[PDB]
Design a protein around this ligand. Structure first.
Ligand SMILES: Cc1cc2nc3c(=O)[nH]c(=O)nc-3n(C[C@H](O)[C@H](O)[C@H](O)COP(=O)(O)OP(=O)(O)OC[C@H]3O[C@@H](n4cnc5c(N)ncnc54)[C@H](O)[C@@H]3O)c2cc1C
Ligand SMILES: NC(=O)c1ccc[n+]([C@@H]2O[C@H](COP(=O)([O-])OP(=O)(O)OC[C@H]3O[C@@H](n4cnc5c(N)ncnc54)[C@H](OP(=O)(O)O)[C@@H]3O)[C@@H](O)[C@H]2O)c1
Length: 257
């Protein structure tokens, strides 16, 4: 099989349905920030592979994945049990549309996500190129429960202290977690908050316009479609195809199987 077999380095469970893990990374595995790759486990004679956004920075020699834990999900029912040292199959060629090159120059980069959709954005917010290209980077992470706001500490406390671009992070990264079913400082769906302009008021930024604002949307199919429409409502135009820069990019965080 032409798959990499990486080794789990660490695992961290965020809550009952979310966990992340880091694995070794084959030097041959190159990827652009935002991309996903197939990862999985050998099950009953065949790799059980699923598309996974690489949540780690593309210049670090390890991979990190932010994962859902579906009770009876073929892969995650097993993946949730990953432990240090475990093998993880990883495909050789990443892919995906959430890449910097396909966003026209702009001033603000909105990373609109829900659930595990924040995964590729974890890579984005750790990518120096993100800060080279934007004045502001807004990571919106919409979840149902506060416990699902995975990486909170990393985003708000660790990343800003990053030895090399923590200053860029402090100056440019706005983290806007959103919770919809539990008391939280920022309540609601980002679609609604953007339509009302509340999201931008909350983060101290002007409403979006096609000239200044770019976005990457990664979330549930439903959110993806509606958020895309919201951005369209502001006059932004999605990149029509890879290699063809646009105002925003989208990728489903998952698909209903
Ligand atoms: C481009 C792309 C990138 C992806 N990146 C990630 C990632 O970084 N992390 C991750 O956990 N998953 C990601 N997914 C989903 C992932 O590929 C699998 O669906 C996941 O790993 C669950 O596999 P499964 O075999 O356990 O359950 P599956 O049979 O895949 O899915 C079972 C059911 O789980 C729900 N489901 C699956 N994945 C999710 C999810 N992430 N969040 C909420 N509900 C979900 C749906 O209701 C689905 O029908 C991605 C999917 C695509 C298409
Ligand atoms: N197929 C879909 O499009 C879809 C979408 C959402 C959930 N689900 C189901 O519920 C499970 C958990 O899905 P999830 O991972 O994304 O967790 P989720 O909790 O269901 O969604 C996380 C966040 O996304 C928000 N959201 C949902 N729909 C939205 C929309 N159209 N626009 C903007 N924000 C939206 C939710 O608000 P609310 O609390 O108001 O829902 C919540 O804050 C999935 O495994 C799936 O079975 C499916």
């Amino acid at each position: 099989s032409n798959l990499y077999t990486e080794r789990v380095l660490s695992v961290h469970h965020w809550n009952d349905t979310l966990f992340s893990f880091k694995t070794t990374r084959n030097p041959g595995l190159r990827f652009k920030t935002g991309q996903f790759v197939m990862i999985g486990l050998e099950v009953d004679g065949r790799p059980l592979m699923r598309a996974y956004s690489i949540a780690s920075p593309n210049y670090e020699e390890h991979l990190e994945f932010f994962s859902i834990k579906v009770p009876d999900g073929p892969l995650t029912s097993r993946l949730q049990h990953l432990k240090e040292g475990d093998e993880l199959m990883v495909s050789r060629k990443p892919t995906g549309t959430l890449v910097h090159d396909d966003l026209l120059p702009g001033k603000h980069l909105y990373l609109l996500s829900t659930g595990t959709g924040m995964a590729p954005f974890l890579s984005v917010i750790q990518d120096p190129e993100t800060y080279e290209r934007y004045e502001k980077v807004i990571l919106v992470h919409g979840v149902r429960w506060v416990s699902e706001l995975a990486y909170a500490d990393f985003i708000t406390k660790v990343l800003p202290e990053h030895e090399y671009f923590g200053d860029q992070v402090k100056e440019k990264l706005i983290y806007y977690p959103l919770v919809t079913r539990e008391p939280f400082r920022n309540q609601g769906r980002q679609t609604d908050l953007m339509r009302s302009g509340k999201l931008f008021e909350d983060i101290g930024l002007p409403p979006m316009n096609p000239q200044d604002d770019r976005a990457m949307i990664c979330g549930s199919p439903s959110m993806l479609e509606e958020t895309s429409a919201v951005l369209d409502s502001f006059g932004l135009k999605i990149s029509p195809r890879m290699g063809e820069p646009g105002d925003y990019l989208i990728e489903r965080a998952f698909v209903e199987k």
